[PDB]
Design a protein around this ligand. Structure first.
Ligand SMILES: [Zn+2]
Ligand SMILES: [Zn+2]
Length: 161
RNA sequence: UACUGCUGUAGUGGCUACUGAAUCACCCCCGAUCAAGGGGGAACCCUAAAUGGGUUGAAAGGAGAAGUCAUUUAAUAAGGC
């Protein structure tokens, strides 16, 4: 037998925040706990809210790669590519893309993205029924608005075309 | 993708202008303050006594200029290049 963890395979276009949240919820860890295990401290707790004041470094991502067992390049593929500007707030979601695959796309957080290219829908910045801003992607235990308990996949037919 | 209203000077701040008091070193009065001192008293000592004269709290100085660090505050940003 060899040391192991509840590994999670990353999605396509998922966020670093959402992937780390899924990794934590499948390992019953905590942001401080994940950081301490990785060896980088509370920096992880920062990444879950997209505060990349000092962009996630190559070392700070290799240390994560050692723990979550995902290749460092595959890790960088959930951060915005070098030079692309993202908004850490508000957290934005497309209902149809969540119904297709239950994840949060880092591409939704780009400053330049307002339309889902494969759904032709104006992506959502707040819950379309109760105007409740979405939580951090790592905090999505499941696909529902916290205040109104409306499933994320449902919101697809409330969001405008 | 930004976010707003539910807000009365209402609370709390800042700035300017005119104003209230002290404007002193023992006390009081008149005066200047980019200049200015003048006068009038008290107490004590000396002095028998003479505004006779004296005393009526002490210290220290290397400045200018330019950067930098630190702390705090505030605005902005979601990295910055
Ligand atoms: Zn979509
Ligand atoms: Zn809601």
């Amino acid at each position: 037998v060899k040391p192991w963890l509840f590994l999670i395979k990353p999605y396509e276009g998922e966020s670093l925040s959402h992937f780390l949240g899924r990794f934590r919820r499948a390992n019953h860890l905590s942001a401080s706990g994940l950081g301490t295990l990785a060896g980088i401290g509370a920096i992880v707790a920062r990444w879950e809210r997209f505060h990349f004041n000092p962009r996630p470094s190559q070392q700070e991502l290799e240390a994560i790669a050692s723990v979550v067992e995902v290749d460092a390049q595959r890790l960088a593929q959930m951060l915005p590519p070098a030079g692309v500007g993202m908004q850490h707030e508000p957290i934005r979601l497309c209902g149809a893309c969540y119904a297709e695959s239950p994840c949060h796309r880092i591409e939704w957080q780009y400053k330049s993205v307002w339309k889902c290219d494969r759904h032709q829908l104006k992506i959502l910045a707040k819950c379309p029924n109760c105007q409740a801003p979405f939580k951090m992607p790592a905090l999505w235990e499941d696909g529902c608005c916290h205040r109104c308990r409306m499933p994320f996949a449902e919101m697809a037919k409330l969001q405008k075309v």
